[PDB]
Design a binder for this molecule. Structure first.
Ligand code: E3U
Length: 334
């Protein structure tokens, strides 16, 4: 017998009641801009399926970021483009400013707004309790928005959250693994960075939903308030579930698997062993305690749950008392 089917408990049918053209990205016709508007300045990063450059728009001398998409299935390129356009103008969603191509070689490239990112491996060291709450709330705005628009990000991690700290400016980037949610659809579990993979991915439960992103966010939260980056550090996908089991415990893991009738690789049960559930307080020490509060642990504890159906929605998260001080301070008359 197979696994129990599942569906999202929020935003379940958003693509169902939207026009075909909204989610049918294969039929999207790209509106191409002008490649000669942009000059490459320096290479920023080497993706495995792209390269990213700082660049200037020479029509207004504004910095931008250009991502060149070498070979790759056109269908993947169209998915990212349709998702970026669907989401543009959404809170803290990176803005796709242009789409261009070599008119001769046909090689496509995405142009994004420039964000003067703080290093991250450095930034988290200097963040205050208030700073983390503020930026968590901003990330949640992005996730609630893209989930409300029927899209799963599927690659939430600190590298995909650009933060211009001196402008209190946050953008969620890298929508290259993002996908439209359709209830009942069996998805590829080969998404997210190892450290931020939800348990559903790690046990090959394919019928997942937006709640995958909330696990990844939980992992980020833990790493920030406990000053341990990344928080769950497995040496591979199997080990990664072991690192989670050693904190959340094996009993709730086995209840999860049992609830969904999931069927585990035989050798999993040998390396999972048996582990009690650990109190979050066990990770609090002199050096990170100023970032930790009981509201923070209650909040974290409601994100990091095996059962994807059990995790907070972004909307519920935003209502948590952890964010009380940032919500008062954000009600802006402008
Ligand atoms: O799939 C991707 C991938 C990236 C990687 C990357 O190109 C890196 O660097 C960026 C950026 C966006 C804005 C920005 O300011 C910046 O520095 C990125 C993306 C957006 C996407 O949808």
């Amino acid at each position: 017998s197979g696994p129990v089917p599942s569906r999202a408990r929020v935003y379940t049918d958003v693509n169902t009641h939207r026009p075909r053209e909204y989610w049918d990205y294969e039929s999207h016709v790209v509106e191409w801009g002008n490649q000669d508007d942009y000059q490459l300045v320096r290479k920023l990063g080497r993706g495995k399926y792209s390269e990213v450059f700082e660049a200037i728009n020479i029509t207004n001398n504004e910095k931008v970021v250009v991502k060149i998409l070498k070979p790759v299935k056109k269908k993947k390129i169209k998915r990212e483009i349709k998702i970026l356009e669907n989401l543009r103008g959404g809170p803290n969603i990176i803005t796709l400013a242009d789409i261009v191509k070599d008119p001769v070689s046909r090689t496509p490239a995405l142009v994004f707004e420039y964000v003067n990112n703080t290093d991250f491996k450095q930034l988290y060291q200097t963040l205050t309790d208030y700073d983390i709450r503020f930026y968590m709330y901003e990330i949640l705005k992005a996730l609630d928005y893209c989930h409300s628009m029927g899209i799963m990000h599927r690659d939430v991690k600190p590298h995909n959250v650009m933060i211009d700290h001196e402008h209190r400016k946050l953008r969620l980037i890298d929508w290259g693994l993002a996908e439209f949610y359709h209830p009942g659809q069996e998805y590829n579990v080969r998404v997210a960075s190892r450290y931020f993979k939800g348990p559903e991915l790690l046990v090959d439960y394919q019928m997942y939903d937006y709640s995958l992103d909330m696990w990844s966010l939980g992992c980020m939260l833990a790493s920030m308030i406990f000053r341990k980056e990344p928080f769950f550090h497995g040496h591979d996908n199997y080990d990664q579930l072991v690192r989670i089991a050693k904190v959340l415990g094996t009993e709730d893991l086995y209840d999860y698997i049992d609830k969904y009738n999931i069927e585990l690789d035989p050798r999993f049960n040998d390396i999972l062993g048996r582990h009690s559930r650990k109190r979050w307080e066990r990770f609090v020490h002199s050096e990170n305690q100023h970032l930790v509060s009981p509201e923070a642990l209650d909040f974290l504890d409601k994100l990091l749950r095996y059962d994807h159906q059990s995790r907070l929605t972004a909307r519920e998260a935003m209502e948590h008392p952890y964010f009380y001080t940032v919500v008062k301070d954000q009600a802006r008359m402008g």
